[PDB]
Amino acid sequence: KPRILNSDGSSNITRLGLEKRGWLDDHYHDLLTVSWPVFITLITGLYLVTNALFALAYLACGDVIENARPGSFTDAFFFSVQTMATIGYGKLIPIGPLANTLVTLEALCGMLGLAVAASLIYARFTRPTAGVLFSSRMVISDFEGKPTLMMRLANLRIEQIIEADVHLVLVRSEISQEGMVFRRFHDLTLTRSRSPIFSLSWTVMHPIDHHSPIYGETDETLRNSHSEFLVLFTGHHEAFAQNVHARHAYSCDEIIWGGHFVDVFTTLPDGRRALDLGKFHEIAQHHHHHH
Amino acid sequence: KPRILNSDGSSNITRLGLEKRGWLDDHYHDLLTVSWPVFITLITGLYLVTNALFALAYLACGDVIENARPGSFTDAFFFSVQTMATIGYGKLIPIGPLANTLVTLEALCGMLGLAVAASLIYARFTRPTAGVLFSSRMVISDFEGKPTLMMRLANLRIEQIIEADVHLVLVRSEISQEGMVFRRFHDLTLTRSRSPIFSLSWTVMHPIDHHSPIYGETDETLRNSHSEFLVLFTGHHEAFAQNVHARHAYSCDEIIWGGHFVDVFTTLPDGRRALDLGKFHEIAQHHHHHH
Amino acid sequence: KPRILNSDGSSNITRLGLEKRGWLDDHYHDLLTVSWPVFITLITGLYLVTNALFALAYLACGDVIENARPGSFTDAFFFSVQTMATIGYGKLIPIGPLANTLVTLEALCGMLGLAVAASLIYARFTRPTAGVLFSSRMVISDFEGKPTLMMRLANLRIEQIIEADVHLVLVRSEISQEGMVFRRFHDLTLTRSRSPIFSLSWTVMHPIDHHSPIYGETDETLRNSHSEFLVLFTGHHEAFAQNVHARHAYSCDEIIWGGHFVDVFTTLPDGRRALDLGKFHEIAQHHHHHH
Amino acid sequence: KPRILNSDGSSNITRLGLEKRGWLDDHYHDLLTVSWPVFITLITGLYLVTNALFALAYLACGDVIENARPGSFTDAFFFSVQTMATIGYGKLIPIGPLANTLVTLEALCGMLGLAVAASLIYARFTRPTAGVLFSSRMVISDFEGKPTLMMRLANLRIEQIIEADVHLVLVRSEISQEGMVFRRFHDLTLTRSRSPIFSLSWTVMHPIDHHSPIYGETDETLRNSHSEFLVLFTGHHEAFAQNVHARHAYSCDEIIWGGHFVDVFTTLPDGRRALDLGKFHEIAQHHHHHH
Ligand SMILES: [Cl-]
Ligand SMILES: [Cl-]
Ligand SMILES: [K+]
Ligand SMILES: [K+]
Ligand SMILES: [K+]
Ligand SMILES: [K+]
Ligand SMILES: [K+]
Numbered sequence A, B, C, D: 001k002p003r004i005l006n007s008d009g010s011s012n013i014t015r016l017g018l019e020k021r022g023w024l025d026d027h028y029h030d031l032l033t034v035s036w037p038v039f040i041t042l043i044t045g046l047y048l049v050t051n052a053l054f055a056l057a058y059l060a061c062g063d064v065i066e067n068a069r070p071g072s073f074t075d076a077f078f079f080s081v082q083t084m085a086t087i088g089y090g091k092l093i094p095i096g097p098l099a100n101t102l103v104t105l106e107a108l109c110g111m112l113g114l115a116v117a118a119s120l121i122y123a124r125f126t127r128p129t130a131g132v133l134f135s136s137r138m139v140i141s142d143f144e145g146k147p148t149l150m151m152r153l154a155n156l157r158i159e160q161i162i163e164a165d166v167h168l169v170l171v172r173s174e175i176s177q178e179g180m181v182f183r184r185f186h187d188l189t190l191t192r193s194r195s196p197i198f199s200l201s202w203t204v205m206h207p208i209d210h211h212s213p214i215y216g217e218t219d220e221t222l223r224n225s226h227s228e229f230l231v232l233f234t235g236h237h238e239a240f241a242q243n244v245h246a247r248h249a250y251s252c253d254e255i256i257w258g259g260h261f262v263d264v265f266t267t268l269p270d271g272r273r274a275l276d277l278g279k280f281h282e283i284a285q286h287h288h289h290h291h
Helices: A035-057 A074-082 A098-123 A220-225 B037-058 B074-083 B098-123 B217-224 C036-059 C075-083 C098-123 C220-223 D038-059 D073-084 D097-123 D220-225
Strands: A014-016 A132-134 A138-143 A146-155 A163-177 A181-187 A193-198 A201-207 A229-238 A241-251 A256-257 A265-268 A272-276 B014-016 B132-134 B138-143 B147-156 B159-175 B179-189 B194-198 B201-207 B228-237 B242-251 B255-257 B265-268 B273-274 C014-016 C132-133 C138-143 C146-155 C161-175 C183-189 C192-199 C199-207 C228-237 C242-251 C255-257 C265-268 C272-276 D014-016 D132-134 D136-145 D147-155 D160-173 D181-187 D194-198 D201-207 D228-237 D242-251 D253-256 D265-267 D270-275
Touching: A035 A074, A035 A098, A035 B098, A035 C199, A074 A098, A074 B098, A098 B098, A098 D038, A098 D073, A098 D097, A098 D242, A146 A163, A163 A201, A163 B228, A181 C220, A220 A256, A229 D160, A229 D194, B037 B074, B037 B098, B037 C098, B074 B098, B074 C098, B074 C183, B098 C098, B132 B242, B132 D073, B147 B159, B147 B228, B159 B201, B159 C228, B194 C228, B194 D097, B217 B255, B228 C132, C036 C075, C036 C098, C036 D097, C036 D265, C075 C098, C098 D097, C132 C228, C132 C242, C146 C161, C146 C228, C161 D228, C192 D228, C220 C255, D038 D097, D073 D097, D132 D228, D132 D242, D147 D160, D147 D228, D160 D201, D220 D253
Parallel strands: A014 D270, A138 A256, A272 B014, B138 B255, B273 C014, C138 C255, C272 D014, D136 D253
Antiparallel strands: A132 A146, A138 A146, A146 A201, A163 A181, A163 A193, A163 A229, A229 A241, A265 A272, B132 B147, B138 B147, B147 B201, B159 B179, B159 B194, B159 B228, B228 B242, B265 B273, C132 C146, C138 C146, C146 C199, C161 C183, C161 C192, C161 C228, C228 C242, C265 C272, D132 D147, D136 D147, D147 D201, D160 D181, D160 D194, D160 D228, D228 D242, D265 D270
């Protein structure tokens, strides 16, 4: 049993091609992902090499930086750094027609330099994360007189997410009248799918009624169709004053028949009502007798 | 009677944990909240203690700043300030291999320095506020032949909010067939929940009909379930050319049975039609006779 | 007959209060509206006064700018300009403990200076406009066998608006069973309210059927209720790769009973199919005979 | 047979007018479209011709730049470049009342200069692209016992698009009871129009049932009405942490009656499950016998 969706809801499918690419994915399309400290290294790195190059560029021009040593790389490099940052001390003024032309070019570079560098930082850099915890398991047990598929999520930060949508989706292999076998998605209807203010915990619920794609199914039948469940969550995070997304996926064998999530809200001596996420993945079962 | 939601719709529940944190909540996740004047202080402060440091850094290098006094902090500090701002007067040029290397590092810093500082300012700094006033009370009284749960809201600014949604929500403790007591959310249907152009005042209305979760309830029964009402409002503000959110919460004892909001629109000698928010929280009751 | 909504769908109602204000409406809440050329003046202006002040600040410190004339404002001012821009020529270096402290403060100022100035520009400055033309009139005439309320809109730019929503809304004075007279909004159902790709012209249509709030109404009855129609349009503009909004309002006497918009699409010798907005406000009527 | 919508869903219709323009379309309304390398040229170019100008401006003032040659353009130009970038070496200080006034003006320019330049870059520059491939053809064939209009789309990048909407739309010429011929849009209902996580491939499907605008139509009848199909796709791209849009259009003769898309998912020796976009446009037909 290989898994079509990973737990984080990434696709396992291998992709085939080697030709074109996202314009701007990389001309984030193709930096704004890797960790903060790394990001800085890269910009730092790029900052140096760029300078050390213009440095190399002045030298190959001659002894054309005043008050500089003959053909010295450090002196020049620092003049470069001193040109690009736009520090312009003066002691190291340019010389002639050429050096000066590299100057105005080098200034331009550090200017855009700064802009791009600003864009990234803001882009990140923004992309905020949702701090949403999904339960490691699902359960099917009775609620309001129906067997109900359930799972739950928690908000890991103190800030509030408002206008929160969850979508719970069955994915499985089906056969058509026409004898074609395909992979189909079903949007399980939830007792409730919109929570206007998500702040603590949320048990999402699919009553398996006669209208449910999983009516009359069992573990065995679910495994036969290699059924999986995909959960997508979204919301506007008060913290970032921005939007957030989280996904997660579950396979059949992560569905506990009969289970009940343990209550996650507590009452305490200090602070009264509380919420203990230590219990978030806890599920109760009734264990049957042996002989 | 302790309150589960505060008037501002913040949650009263105590949260339990002490382990992880929002990546970027603080690496706004963890500044862009505190007041303008404060923000400036902080950046000002940071600006100083970063300079003073590099200052300390040059000194611990030796008498390595030219035209500077021996081991003087002020002179150096100013050279720092003069390096980071990228002012580069020149009179205070760096000395040797080391100082110069701190320089290029210090320039980088003030560069990102500027970018971050720009990001924050724009981030704020944006997050605009909705200037929405909620009535201090709710009422239940007859409209179009049904008892109706009502409350109202007003736009506190001259700008217009377009595409405005309100969601009015009953939260209460219920018992399931299976003898489990939980807290449930109901979306009260509104005679109208979308207002395409919100500009003045808006009375939001829940006709308590047979389909209403509060059909046949009374003050007594509402208190019994510790019922609360949560209101979320959102919209695109023409002002900021951006989105806005406001919430508020009400308990049972802020529902006035029989009350009628007072009309808030006026006709006047000058300007004709007007709107008086002075009367926004005013509610009419019929008082019954004593003996 | 005074008008409750203006043609541009602004509210005519006078607003009453004089106490609080939008935090950031103005601390755009309270610049990013006035025209480009004006914007520049203001920043230019602000740029000068700020400098001329720090100038005044150095002087009141003494003859503390080197190579400057005694107590001269121009010299100082230029040193200020030379400090704030972070030009730092050098010929005009600061003097002592105090001047230098104004320096680091002045640099900070021009830094934020630049950031704010950047934020605004981007904010504007963004807020893009929709170039949407609304017809000066509405018409009620027969379409598909029903009298139909209609009006139309055109896209004034070459770019495309995608995902376009229009909302057409009756506003009028009504009376409740309970003898209260209020102003009510009705969302007229449109044959079609979503146009996924708005690019040329769009006649929006409300079939007055038995379900319509304006079933059996007439000019006379519409005027009695001081009925108005409010139109809100929104969409994502391909141009700005951003969102856009437009509104407009119509009173009774801008509804032409019997009228038909003139066809606005043409066929031509050159370019074949065309679209002539010169005809956009043209309406056909049948004029009855005299004696 | 001329085509009303092109394959990319641009409109073929000629537009008529020559009077007003988008405020900011160009005052992106009217730069942020042309290719990266080009963009840089333009800013580079602009950077130069703004400097050369101020250069010309100083000269026409006299020999007013110190340490500069008499009336030399290069020297001045570089002083310009050295003023605008805010490099401020010093060796080339300004002279008198006038030069200095051009200075503070030139600094302002390079300041806004930088801000605008930063805005554009971020604006671009953002507008991210969707990397969505549409099948070159449509098909009508039986699925679940109904003839079904189908086509499919694929994600060309490794990143995921979440909350993806597709809208498939019949456009054709119709005649009203009132003998008026117009162009009408129909929203074909899809067996599924929202895909919460689009990542690989998606066959979009319109079961032609009794409720379908294309019930009982044929190639002949479709051509008669000059029917076209328009597809709009949108989604939030995880990559850019932003939104994306793609459209495409199809005419009658790009609908293959009886065809079946070839399965695009594969199983392999290495990596097991894969997806081959090489087969994306492949369609199966049953070819009938000759004599
Ligand atoms: Cl499907
Ligand atoms: Cl209403
Ligand atoms: K400088
Ligand atoms: K200098
Ligand atoms: K500088
Ligand atoms: K300088
Ligand atoms: K000097």
